[PDB]
């Protein structure tokens, strides 16, 4: 039988704790220094309450439908409330319960990205309906497709820690949303919690404390550091001087850009990605016109960018861990593009339905 | 001989770091956004200085008297300054020094719960006398009784991470105390540090990175998420709307409620506990009238609740890891009740003596 | 061949994450509550941008020159961009990539100590030139000398986690710098992040989750707790009352003092060191007159102190792990002194050149 390795258990639970920390309080403090002061308490409440909600839907049926065996698009309902998962059941080289929690913490941050930006302008019970509709019909299926062995996975999509599942996904939900700064120290601190937590997020994605977890970690430093410089140089060049928000934005942009690529590229490629992601993030927001919904522009643009550049940098040629066998780089790219296209369209269509449903149900705009 | 497993060493030191983080700055920031602005600096000083004091009493004789072999109520003085503990001495499957530190971090948070609430209204040197009297005559014996193999342990009390030792204990000290909000973002952040740190606290309690550490972790998410919803629903129902402090309070209430139960129950039971704990916490504070001493009401009520419900949910029947052999559920409950009753009365009597001593010595009320 | 142990991999990556957390946001928030309010945004930007810069110089050639095999003073350029380091290459009992990152995080905090204090009064591009000159001609060589097997190492200098490399080094750079509080809660929080992160820093220094990592951890608690009390008693005695900044300063002073000694002394010696370091820190700053450049006085004085007292407390006699064989205590001291003297003079001479270069290049004082 497969046996759980206590080291990987230890690593993976510390990593889950760090990804939880990205939401609570990481993204909550990031948005809190951005949104209008009079909406902060309300945003923090909404991010907390929906974080809880997500933890519960995950245990009730979320995990089972994303990770259970099913079809190309969703799993099954045989793990309602973690039924039939023996306590000692092993997944990979860790106990499955730890996989449940690790994966759950990703659902949480994804939702956090959206709720934090939209708390301001959305009626609460509308946010809840929304979270439910979209976590279920979008986050799960896509999780299932990329990581649950569905459509995208079996065509060989490469997304080490959730370019598509987390970022592009949430950026689309957020932008469909949008379609319908007071404390910078606070923003810095949240960016800081995010970055530090993003090590569980990227490294923990290896599922073990091995040399890929190691590669992922070091690429996480390289990319963020490079996206920071690249944002800064660009801000310095366009605006005459760097800025604190420009620096944090830079960091976030490298973190997002490296997310799908961290476990497959050379630190070489990490630093090319960080530069391009930071430049792209800046260029991105610079175009968004036509707050704090720019986050969706950075998450989305940098997610698109990192997902594409994963299909280049993974090459052995370019210092990467190598493409699947029989897979040319030209081909891996089609596949990265197809996964990006599917994520965008899926999240969008469900986003639209989620909001529309809440609207026709409780009304969207706050009372 | 028993041999230390490097994975459990690694896990247990990261877990100690997280529990330390619950005090420094977790509970310090929680109280800091609650107490009056003009008392914050002073509270933070007092929580820091007494945290130090506790770290030192722990090394000097704390550990030895709580964990050394003795009687039902206390250990011995054969580990003064960690004497006779060889560096490679192994306890469980980790080096004993790590056990020293893990256990020490619990003493620290327990004291933090009390000092943070009472810094406002207590003369400093009075707080110090108090910490000394009570850590020694109450925290240690009870630690020894529940975890040091004393009275309660050998009657089969179940308390995975310190319902009685930490929470009920400190709630009683705090309430005997009491008997004699300016920055909600700050409060959120401390609640956040607490929650994330509470993973070392609950999972680290398994003493190894095994499947019980895994069960504990996932129950930690389930309960907190559920207590949050349960607090919120109740606040929404009684007050017409949820609130940020109501949400953080919810989280804390699930965390406390799940504390004695995390390593013995099904995620099933976790989520029943989280709901009831969150409802009870709300009901609890709602009765306390007749600030920020409500914390003691939540800690105490939810501690009582989780300790009782551990004697139910541990049942195999109810998804739990099973009661000791020959132990009926009816019996486990008597035992949970007896441990609750003893903790309450013990902490109270020593609390009273601690304060009285400081009063008759330096005067209690601040100059 | 040497084989990487997954536990040590897991421990060492969590430890790197914690040391990163000491800079981002630990030292950034420490200084941020200290410096003038109108300079905070600018300081935070400068600490972020130079942190990035350091991450990149480290990968490009930093690591290779500090840790590669060379002479007494520097390594080589055979690990440019981590060339020729196979992904599975093992260093000690962890993968080398993890060593790269761990060591990198030390370069980052060291620079953070300096930039945070000097951001106020230094022209930005001047800070960048400086970071480059000094990281390269000072941090690396000294890293190489103490930890890269150079001069100091091979004379048997004892510096477990960087008394000289990190603290004395940066204190000298900072003081040569100097030569040419608004939010105390914020300061507390940064002190808090620092302390918690300092467990990766001290324990991770063992390179494995073993009993020395354990010794280091517990000495980290003992020393900080003792330096806090010692600062406090001294403040209470000289100023009539303890204070929040006096408490945080105390903690920092024990942390610095214990840094070179944590892995070699008895908790006995830890607590003698913490007391003396806290007293010395206070006495130190008390003399500095003739802000927030006192940090350099504490870092420097306490670094000098801990490095000397390592040459005493390591003795078997005094509870320590024992001196090298054939090494008398009298001799170990000469060696501690010689390493202190070399670090001071080296960092100073390069510091001076670094600033002078930036001055003659962009001008030092801000426009």
């Amino acid at each position: 039988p497969a046996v759980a390795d206590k080291a990987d258990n230890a690593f993976m639970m510390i990593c889950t704790a760090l990804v939880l920390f990205m939401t609570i309080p990481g993204i909550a403090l990031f948005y809190g220094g951005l949104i209008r002061g009079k909406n902060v308490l309300s945003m923090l409440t909404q991010v907390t309450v929906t974080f809880a909600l997500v933890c519960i839907l995950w245990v009730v049926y979320g995990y089972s439908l994303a990770f259970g065996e099913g079809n190309n698009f969703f799993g099954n309902i045989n793990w309602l409330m973690l039924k039939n998962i023996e306590l000692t059941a092993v997944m990979g080289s860790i106990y499955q319960y730890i996989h449940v929690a690790f994966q759950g913490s990703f659902a949480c941050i994804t939702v956090g990205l959206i709720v934090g930006a939209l708390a301001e302008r959305i009626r609460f019970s509308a946010v809840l309906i929304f979270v439910v509709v979209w976590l279920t019909l979008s986050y799960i299926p896509i999780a299932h497709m990329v990581w649950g062995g569905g459509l995208l996975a079996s065509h060989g999509a490469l997304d080490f820690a959730g370019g598509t599942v987390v970022h592009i996904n949430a950026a689309i939900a957020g932008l469909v949303g949008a379609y319908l700064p007071h404390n910078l120290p606070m923003v810095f601190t949240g960016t800081a919690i995010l970055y530090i937590g993003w090590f569980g997020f990227n490294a923990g994605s290896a599922g073990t404390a091995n040399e890929i977890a190691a590669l992922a970690f070091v690429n996480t430093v390289v990319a963020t550091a490079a996206a920071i410089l690249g944002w800064i140089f660009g801000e310095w060049a366009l605006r005459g001087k760097p800025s604190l928000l420009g620096a944090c934005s830079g960091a976030i942009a490298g973190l997002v850009g490296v997310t799908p690529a961290c476990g497959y590229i050379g630190v070489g490629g990490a630093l090319i990605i960080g530069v391009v992601a930071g430049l792209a993030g800046l260029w991105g927001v610079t175009m968004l016109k036509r707050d704090p919904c720019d986050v969706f522009g950075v998450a989305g643009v940098c997610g698109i960018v990192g997902c594409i550049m994963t299909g280049i940098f993974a090459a052995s040629s370019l210092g990467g861990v190598g493409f699947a066998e029989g897979v040319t780089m030209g081909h891996q790219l089609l596949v990265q593009l197809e996964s990006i296209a599917i994520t965008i369209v899926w999240s969008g269509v469900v986003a639209f339905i989620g909001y529309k449903l809440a609207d026709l149900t409780v009304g969207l705009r706050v009372p």
Side-chain angles (χ1 to χ4, degrees), chain A residues 121-124 126-127 130 180 354-367:
Chain A
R121 318 109 190 286
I122 231 77
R123 152 174 320 232
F124 197 155
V127 75
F130 172 81
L180 320 160
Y355 295 117
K356 282 294 184 140
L357 179 82
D359 193 25
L360 304 170
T361 211
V362 288
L364 266 178
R365 39 271 156 73
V366 219

Side-chain angles (χ1 to χ4, degrees), chain A residues 33-159:
Chain A
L34 282 180
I35 69 180
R36 168 71 203 111
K38 71 205 198 157
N39 302 312
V40 171
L41 288 187
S42 179
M43 181 268 304
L44 297 179
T45 306
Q46 290 204 10
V47 176
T48 296
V49 165
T50 58
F51 166 85
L53 177 71
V54 165
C55 292
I56 303 282
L57 302 173
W58 192 250
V59 160
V60 185
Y61 66 77
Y63 181 76
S64 180
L65 274 178
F67 296 92
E69 188 232 76
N71 51 75
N72 272 315
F73 307 88
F74 61 53
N76 57 63
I77 45 159
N78 296 150
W79 295 338
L80 252 85
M81 275 323 285
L82 310 195
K83 218 51 196 313
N84 298 334
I85 303 194
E86 300 293 340
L87 190 35
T88 47
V90 174
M91 165 106 327
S93 67
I94 61 170
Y95 287 112
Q96 180 154 26
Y97 269 53
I98 302 177
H99 185 249
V100 171
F102 190 66
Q103 285 306 332
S105 69
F106 278 57
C108 288
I109 182 59
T110 305
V111 170
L113 306 183
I114 306 171
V115 173
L118 292 180
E120 265 176 312
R121 318 109 190 286
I122 231 77
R123 152 174 320 232
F124 197 155
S125 66
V127 75
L128 292 162
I129 288 149
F130 172 81
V131 167
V132 168
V133 179
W134 182 90
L135 184 74
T136 301
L137 303 163
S138 176
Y139 182 88
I140 288 169
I142 293 152
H144 188 79
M145 274 181 295
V146 188
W147 292 329
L151 191 68
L152 303 182
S154 67
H155 287 103
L158 290 181
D159 181 350

Side-chain angles (χ1 to χ4, degrees), chain A residues 299-322:
Chain A
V301 162
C302 300
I304 295 174
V305 170
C307 288
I308 297 196
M309 285 190 100
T310 299
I312 290 161
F313 292 82
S316 308
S317 336
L318 299 175
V321 309

Side-chain angles (χ1 to χ4, degrees), chain A residues 243-268:
Chain A
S243 71
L244 172 49
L245 184 58
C248 311
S249 306
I252 289 299
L255 278 183
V256 163
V258 82
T259 275
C262 48
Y264 304 116
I265 67 181
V267 289

